[PDB]
Design a protein around this ligand. Structure first.
Ligand code: CYC
Ligand code: CYC
Ligand code: CYC
Ligand code: CYC
Lengths: 171, 171
């Protein structure tokens, strides 16, 4: 409704009906909103798979994490690791829904590096796990089956930026 | 983006991903936006037909308006009458696009009765012309050909309210 009211102001200033350009512009706002909801829906609905695929890739790459002495050794520690990735993924979907990183920053990333240091969690391995969630999430967002075909590339880039910001915040 | 950010706040307060209810709610916001744009597009694109159909119905019903002594007698007066209906229709599409009557009131309806009195234009006949534009506009908005089938009844009621407000403002 924000973009619609601004277009009214512009048309009224001209004293004209909406132009074809203004109608296509507003139509693209509605299309972008719908694509954004598909991305949030696909990431939300598949949240456990995104977490599991990333964790599997991280542990296979960094087996020390789940060998004796590792920070994610024993299932109890492993489970808390999966829970952390779920939390970060949750705030990435919030950012995707809102179109900005304000909640992701204020509620999740601000001070998170310092929580991990208080705990001895290796933030650089959290960053790798977040970057792997990114790739799993994007493969799910970009799957063309089950959805109206179209371009989601700008949205996928924006989603990648949220994952990269979260990873860089904890490294 | 306004409704999306509010949903984020609610989900974060719960500490959860978006629920299916919140996703359906936001999906209906995008659907309603698209339907609203169809209504504005259909009324804008057919503006001349909406004006002409209403004027034809008004003049046939009130022939004195275009007989000698009438306020819309001679084509010059007739043309200014059609131009007035076009203006009011324009601000009704602004209200439909914005979802409220704030611009329609402030820019079009406020003081319009007093302009017509300064001119001797019979406001009650303007009101009849506006009410006939309403019926022509709604028949165009509600036509099911050329568009995805669905319910537009709440939108059509809101559009009728804008036309009725404009008519009642000049009667
Ligand atoms: C990018 C992520 C992928 C993709 C997205 C895409 N979707 C559309 C169309 C729509 N998506 C929705 C969203 C919903 N409908 C519902 O019922 C719900 C709740 C379960 C949601 C979240 C809607 C309403 C539409 C419009 C109707 C439709 O189904 O088509 C498009 C087309 C947008 C456009 O017109 O340009 C796109 C691109 N499609 C891809 O190919 C990407 C993989
Ligand atoms: C009520 C007025 C009538 C009606 C509306 C209706 N439309 C949809 C679907 C869509 N309408 C649009 C709008 C545009 N697409 C463009 O390219 C442009 C610029 C020319 C505009 C303004 C869009 C993007 C959609 C979604 C994709 C599609 O074409 O379907 C619906 C379905 C909404 C829903 O999912 O519930 C409806 C109901 N349909 C009727 O039957 C009324 C007569
Ligand atoms: C997984 C990729 C890595 C991993 C994680 C890990 N975390 C813990 C414990 C905690 N994680 C948090 C994180 C948060 N709390 C919040 O409120 C938010 C945002 C809103 C975040 C991101 C916290 C507070 C804790 C401590 C309390 C709790 O566990 O609930 C562990 C257990 C630590 C231990 O020594 O047992 C682990 C293992 N560890 C790895 O090695 C992976 C790289
Ligand atoms: C048509 C249904 C009725 C009709 C109309 C009529 N109007 C005029 C002249 C004017 N109409 C306006 C109205 C507006 N100016 C604005 O800025 C706005 C909103 C932004 C409105 C609604 C104005 C200012 C005028 C005077 C200046 C001008 O004509 O541009 C006439 C001509 C009056 C005359 O005596 O020649 C007519 C006929 N008359 C009817 O009988 C219909 C019921």
């Amino acid at each position: 409704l924000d973009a619609f009211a601004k277009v009214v102001s512009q048309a009224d200033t001209k004293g004209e009906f909406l132009s074809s350009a203004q109608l296509d512009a507003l139509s693209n706002v509605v299309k972008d909103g719908s694509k954004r909801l598909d991305a949030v829906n696909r990431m939300t609905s598949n949240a456990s798979t995104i977490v599991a695929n990333a964790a599997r890739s991280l542990f296979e790459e960094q087996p020390q994490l789940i060998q004796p002495g590792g920070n994610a050794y024993t299932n109890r520690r492993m489970a808390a690791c999966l829970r952390d990735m779920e939390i970060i993924l949750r705030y990435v979907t919030y950012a995707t829904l809102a179109g900005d990183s304000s909640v992701l920053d204020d509620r999740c990333l601000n001070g998170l590096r310092e929580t991990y240091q208080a705990l001895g969690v290796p933030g650089g391995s959290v960053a790798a796990g977040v970057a792997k969630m990114k790739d799993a999430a994007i493969a799910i967002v970009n799957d063309p089956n089950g959805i109206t075909k179209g371009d989601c590339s700008a949205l996928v880039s924006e989603i990648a930026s949220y994952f990269d910001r979260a990873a860089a915040a904890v490294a």
